[PDB]
Ligand binder design. Sequence first.
Ligand SMILES: Cc1occc1C(=S)Nc1ccc(Cl)c(/C=N/OC(C)(C)C)c1
Lengths: 406, 537
Amino acid sequence: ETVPVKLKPGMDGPKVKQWPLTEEKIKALVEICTEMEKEGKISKIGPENPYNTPVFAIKKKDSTKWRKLVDFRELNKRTQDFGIPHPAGLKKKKSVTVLDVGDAYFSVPLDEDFRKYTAFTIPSINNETPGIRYQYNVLPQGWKGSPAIFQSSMTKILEPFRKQNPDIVIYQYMDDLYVGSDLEIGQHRTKIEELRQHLLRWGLTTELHPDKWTVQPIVLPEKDSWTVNDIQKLVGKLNWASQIYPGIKVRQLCKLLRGTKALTEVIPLTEEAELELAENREILKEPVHGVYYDPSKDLIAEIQKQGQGQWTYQIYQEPFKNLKTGKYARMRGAHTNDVKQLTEAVQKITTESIVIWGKTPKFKLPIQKETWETWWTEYWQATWIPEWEFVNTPPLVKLWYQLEKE
Amino acid sequence: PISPIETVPVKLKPGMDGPKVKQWPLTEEKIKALVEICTEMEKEGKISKIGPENPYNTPVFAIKKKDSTKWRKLVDFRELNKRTQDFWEVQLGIPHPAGLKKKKSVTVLDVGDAYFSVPLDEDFRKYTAFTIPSINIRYQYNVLPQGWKGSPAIFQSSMTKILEPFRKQNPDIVIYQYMDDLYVGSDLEIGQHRTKIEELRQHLLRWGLTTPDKKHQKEPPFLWMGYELHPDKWTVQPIVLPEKDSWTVNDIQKLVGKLNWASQIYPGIKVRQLCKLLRGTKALTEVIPLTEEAELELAENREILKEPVHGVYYDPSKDLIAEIQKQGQGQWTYQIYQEPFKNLKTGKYARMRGAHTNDVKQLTEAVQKITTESIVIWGKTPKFKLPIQKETWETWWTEYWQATWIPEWEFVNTPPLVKLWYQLEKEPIVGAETFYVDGAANRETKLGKAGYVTNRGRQKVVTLTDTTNQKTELQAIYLALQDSGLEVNIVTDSQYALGIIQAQPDQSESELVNQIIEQLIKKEKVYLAWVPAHKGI
Ligand SMILES: Cc1occc1C(=S)Nc1ccc(Cl)c(/C=N/OC(C)(C)C)c1
């Protein structure tokens, strides 16, 4: 028996255009789809169905086998909401492990009348062939309603491992299961493998470190002698920084800056300026008081290209009231590609948001839409897809976070 | 002939009802004709008579043809089409000639009146109701009606199913449907090819779909959107330009249009002076005196369009090469080929400077655009031969604020190379003079002052009428640049100058910024520094 799923009142199904795909992945999808059709998971559809959702194929980390991924963001946004629990435990765990339990959904049938809305299309190179149109008959991976409907079965399936191991945390966010334990790596890895078998046994098949992620302080430079330029740079940063920490003062230094001196001119600090600075260093030794996460408001992630392979980010809900901030160094191998590094970073950051608040952040990316749209899929390796917008990084915000400690 | 194929379920938009529009009174003759014509398809079972239980109606009129003066009929489904549901995209794009492979032979079967062979959803049929009047006769369609929104869509998918078996049986044959034409190509020997065609023909015939005989069907060369397709190569129809005495504005526009399309295949084509003839045009039909600069240009273009162009098709076993050239500031030409000088495709782009850019950023955008069309056509991206040194690229991209990338490429020394016009110093220049520039203007009165004072005692100030703050600030920076020597340190509090430091643009929409840019380039070493406003600094 199937549960009746509906679109939020007044909405209509998604009619998103398919992005062009490479030969390599069109073939991969054709293969994957013919098979899924045999198994009865999906079915060919005619023109009478006007809806569409983009599809593509990615290759998992350590897996040289193509995996089909759909972009349900639009559908999910139009899909009605529906006990969806998030614990603050794995936030503190010594280790967490993500598990791909997407396969489970394919067993469960999807309400007949909602099926139309899951239409997708495999394109043809040079439009020499019409698109191959399919639609899901079972629960779609990457859809929000799926983990929802599969809830019951899921809880049952896990309860035994749960009750026999309440010292472990298990969190389900869409196609993934986050398993965290403080148990040393030996027991953790072994216990995970055991859990896998526990799942495998039912049919369906499938390291992180939370308490090591610290918000770093903003360290200010230190010289034996300061030049007019050094001071100017320092003052500029502090002045901007006072929007976060209102206790930051800059007048005493600004005083030394009065007078048209050469930038290379060396200036000794007045004892008053020396204090002012020492005082500021203190305020910067810790994050601003008063920042509390609000579940009813969107989470936001800003990323700034720092060059040399470095990237900086800040998760917040209100500008300047950052819940978390961090620095990311490019993965070994992406020594020439920015899109590669950026996507990796986008994923890493999303994961953390999930672990902590169980919610994906809306990204503000320092890249041109065209560049992103063209190559993001090539390096994506997650079942979910967060929201994003493209922006122009204010130079000031960049110079600031460049100052984080190591 | 009607066919025994599953009708596709069709319904009207949510909450809408069928057409109910007035039937024009015709002539005793037009009525005569339509009576005859309708009785024809009536006997064929295409249309059936209906009684008063149908409150819908679509206007039907008569029209004499080109080849016979004999009357044809026309049904105006405009209204019905408004009330009909939407179907998925009919054709998601046309195949570009450069993405085709060569075939030994290509034949097109005109499945002409096939719309009228595919049965319409029985339920929907009622909406197709129409009326043949009298001087002082109801029917409805039982088959896809010429003109109805869903016809092409449904017809296509039908043709798709019907061909699935023949395609499987013959994986060495290529069929491509477009409208009511069926293009079929292959690499089989002419006799074998001829046979398969007939086999297909009889396969479609088995479904009532009539097709033209070997005696009557079409053959190559084919016309495909500007191209002249051959089994061996494609050719561009030498574009004809009308040499005339009196030119009207409208005429110039159309001319510039055709010329612009041409430039994709024929770099060299210019329309700069031809465009000038449009300035201040009061009417579309006003005649314009062709400037001699325009005469020399229009002429030089006829010469270019004399030499035709024939390229080659795509060979999957060969690598794809894309080469790019900068014809001018913001102008790039590219040609994709597999074997040198044997071009598959060519094109060009003109980039309206916009806010503020630089050549390297622009090159990047071309590469990006090319990469996208490549993937659509060949399903893969080309190896790039770019007029830029690996050193230059590395220096720029590693520091640029925005994420950017260029796929596997290789430097090709084809002048003029794109290069970094200037690079601001990372730290203050020792020895160099230091200009503390500042500018302010009254927003409302548009009155301002711009100036500077240096660590060497030099100073200046200028009063500006009809200026804005941003202009003043930049102007301050311009002056500092003018009066400074080869090496300069400049401090400003301008929020907009922060942009230049980060982006280091070599072109902008603002002529003023451009002035500053020219000056920056002239300098040997420039160090720009920003400081917050209204402070000590
Ligand atoms: C997709 C296709 O349909 C029929 C032939 C072909 C191919 S791959 N090669 C090819 C080779 C020579 C010619 Cl002349 C044409 C004709 N193409 O016409 C269209 C683009 C309508 C298929 C096509």
